Amino acid sequence: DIDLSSLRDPAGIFELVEVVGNGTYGQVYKGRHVKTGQLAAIKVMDVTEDEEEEIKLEINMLKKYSHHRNIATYYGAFIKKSPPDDQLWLVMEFCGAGSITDLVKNTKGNTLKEDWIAYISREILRGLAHLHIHHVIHRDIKGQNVLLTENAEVKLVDFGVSANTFIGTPYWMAPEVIACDENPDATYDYRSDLWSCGITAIEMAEGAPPLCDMHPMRALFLIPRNPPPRLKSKKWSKKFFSFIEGCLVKNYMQRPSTEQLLKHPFIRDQPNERQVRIQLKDHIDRTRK
Amino acid sequence: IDLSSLRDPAGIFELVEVVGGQVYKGRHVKTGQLAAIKVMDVTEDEEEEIKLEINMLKKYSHHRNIATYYGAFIKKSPPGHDDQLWLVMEFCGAGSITDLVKNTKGNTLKEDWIAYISREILRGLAHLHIHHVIHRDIKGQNVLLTENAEVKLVDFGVSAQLDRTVGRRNTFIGTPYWMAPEVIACDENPDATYDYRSDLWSCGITAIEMAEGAPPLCDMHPMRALFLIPRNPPPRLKSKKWSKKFFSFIEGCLVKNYMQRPSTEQLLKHPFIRDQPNERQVRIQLKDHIDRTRK
Numbered sequence: 159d160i161d162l163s164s165l166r167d168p169a170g171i172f173e174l175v176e177v178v179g180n181g182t183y184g185q186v187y188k189g190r191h192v193k194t195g196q197l198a199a200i201k202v203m204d205v206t207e208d209e210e211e212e213i214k215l216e217i218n219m220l221k222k223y224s225h226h227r228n229i230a231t232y233y234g235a236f237i238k239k240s241p242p243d244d245q246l247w248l249v250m251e252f253c254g255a256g257s258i259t260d261l262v263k264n265t266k267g268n269t270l271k272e273d274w275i276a277y278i279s280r281e282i283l284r285g286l287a288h289l290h291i292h293h294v295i296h297r298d299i300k301g302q303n304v305l306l307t308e309n310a311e312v313k314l315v316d317f318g319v320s321a322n323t324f325i326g327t328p329y330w331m332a333p334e335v336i337a338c339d340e341n342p343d344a345t346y347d348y349r350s351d352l353w354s355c356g357i358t359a360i361e362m363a364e365g366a367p368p369l370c371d372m373h374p375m376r377a378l379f380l381i382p383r384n385p386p387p388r389l390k391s392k393k394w395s396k397k398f399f400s401f402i403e404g405c406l407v408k409n410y411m412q413r414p415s416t417e418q419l420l421k422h423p424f425i426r427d428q429p430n431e432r433q434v435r436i437q438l439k440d441h442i443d444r445t446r447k
Numbered sequence: 448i449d450l451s452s453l454r455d456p457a458g459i460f461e462l463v464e465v466v467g468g469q470v471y472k473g474r475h476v477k478t479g480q481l482a483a484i485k486v487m488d489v490t491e492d493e494e495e496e497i498k499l500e501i502n503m504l505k506k507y508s509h510h511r512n513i514a515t516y517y518g519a520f521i522k523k524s525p526p527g528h529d530d531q532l533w534l535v536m537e538f539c540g541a542g543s544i545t546d547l548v549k550n551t552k553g554n555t556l557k558e559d560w561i562a563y564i565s566r567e568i569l570r571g572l573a574h575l576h577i578h579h580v581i582h583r584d585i586k587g588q589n590v591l592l593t594e595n596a597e598v599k600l601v602d603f604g605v606s607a608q609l610d611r612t613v614g615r616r617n618t619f620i621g622t623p624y625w626m627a628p629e630v631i632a633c634d635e636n637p638d639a640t641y642d643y644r645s646d647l648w649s650c651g652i653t654a655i656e657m658a659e660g661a662p663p664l665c666d667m668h669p670m671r672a673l674f675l676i677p678r679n680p681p682p683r684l685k686s687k688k689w690s691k692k693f694f695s696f697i698e699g700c701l702v703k704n705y706m707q708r709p710s711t712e713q714l715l716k717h718p719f720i721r722d723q724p725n726e727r728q729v730r731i732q733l734k735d736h737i738d739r740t741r742k
């Protein structure tokens with residue numbers, strides 16, 4: 159429950175600073191709570207035709223399901239009314255260190271240490287488990303939607319695709335979400351996010367998802383046809399290969415649940431957990447340029 | 448003005464709107480002439496891609512049906528920061544043809560308006576096609592009107608696709624509704640085979656958009672529409688009110704197999720496009736709309 163009629167103007171409450179990206183629909187600004195100076199991420203979306211119900215939906219999911227440490231917390235919603243085509247500001251917790259895509263991009267050799275991948279993946283999985291118990295599928299798990307705070311906390315964003323008129327990036331999409339001759343009605347199940355989580359792990363390991371060198375339309379054709387993607391390097395632990403294999407089961411019917419993957423030795427057994435939190439924290443401060 | 452450029456925009460153009468893929472109203476420094484400027488954050492590797500794509504650019508003159516592409520500029524930022532790519536084009540004050548059908552009762556345009564607009568799109572396309580260029584994104588949002596009811600095609604360097612190869616939005620599939628069956632990869636088309644006739648399918652979808660306010664399959668999830676476009680027979684107009692000539696035009700554009708689709712020149716001779724007796728009155732009817740909405 160949320161009505162656009164009750165929603166106040168953001169003037170004096172929140173102000174925009176600089177653009178830090180975009181979502182499914184609308185630009186994402188680094189915002190500031192006027193009275194305290196506290197940073198907040200502001201999603202500014204134009205309320206138009208069809209988008210009126212699409213943006214309204216994101217508000218209800220963000221409001222009700224962001225009450226977990228691994229999901230960026232919903233603060234509030236506002237409408238900066240323009241002549242009778244308005245602008246909606248969706249305010250949530252700011253994640254200072256940026257996306258995990260940005261992390262691997264700003265790392266020597268565009269790869270992260272295996273124990274960093276283990277920590278990040280578990281945090282994605284924990285946020286996913288919370289959504290899945292609440293009968294919610296994220297539907298857009300990718301490094302761009304996995305953000306870090308200044309204190310190396312991992313948080314999930316964007317309920318823009320969650321269960322518009324544009325098809326986004328295909329590389330993190332599970333085979334079953336792509337419609338083809340033997341799969342006409344797609345078939346989104348919660349396990350679709352686990353495939354996406356595995357592709358995000360290859361992204362942390364190699365700096366890019368598998369098939370990144372393909373035209374997006376060609377990758378969309380290949381994902382359901384190709385065998386499960388594999389890590390290029392042999393350096394990785396047997397536990398990491400097994401985790402990737404676990405996430406990337408082609409047929410979602412034999413793919414493990416979020417709960418099963420949370421018990422995977424790669425996720426479950428993390429002895430250097432405290433040190434990687436320090437290492438990661440140190441790395442985000444090191445990126446001072 | 449050089450079209451094989453990458454120079455800094457200082458002294459040539461400037462943003463006469465808020466600083467910050469969004470498009471801002473700009474102007475030529477020396478003349479004060481209005482322009483449309485697209486601004487994108489580009490990486491160091493992305494600027495190299497731009498250099499190569501500038502080498503791939505085809506040459507073509509100004510045309511009354513193409514909002515003139517002026518060039519590519521780079522606005523610098525400190526060393527190690529994301530510079531911004533500038534793509535400059537002729538300004539079209541009255542907005543898109545989608546805006547035109549949205550600001551019309553019952554979200555439909557008069558058949559003679561559809562005939563005039565389609566012919567203008569076709570004329571701009573013929574100019575690009577004769578110069579070995581595919582527009583690749585013919586849709587109502589990319590067909591603009593000037594203050595004087597002139598129809599112009601959006602061009603931010605269509606011969607190299609500079610606004611579609613850089614930025615985060617470059618790896619996205621995009622909206623599927625105006626896509627021709629051959630541009631969508633499927634079982635019998637494992638490779639997206641783009642051709643000049645792909646714009647002609649888009650032209651038929653833009654005509655249904657002018658007629659119904661939305662493209663066919665608009666009610667479908669974009670992923671489902673992408674699966675249906677190559678599988679479904681050619682889309683058709685819902686209403687039976689339309690002239691036989693209009694149905695034939697739609698049918699002409701929307702030939703499923705592009706190998707069997709007519710050329711821009713053939714479609715320019717179609718009775719729906721060729722025979723326009725109320726052309727003068729339509730140019731007045733459209734000019735009247737621009738003025739009525741200018742308040």
Ligand SMILES: c1cc(Nc2ncnn3cc(-c4cn[nH]c4)cc23)ccn1
Pocket residue numbers: 178179180181182186199201230250251252253254255256257305315316317
């Ligand atoms: C909702 C939120 C969203 N983005 C962000 N949400 C929250 N915090 N945040 C920090 C950065 C960021 C920091 N540095 N660079 C980008 C970007 C964001 C995207 C889509 N939907």
Ligand SMILES: [Mg+2]
Pocket residue numbers: 223225288292
């Ligand atoms: Mg809960």
Ligand SMILES: [Mg+2]
Pocket residue numbers: 224225226227228229230231
């Ligand atoms: Mg939370």
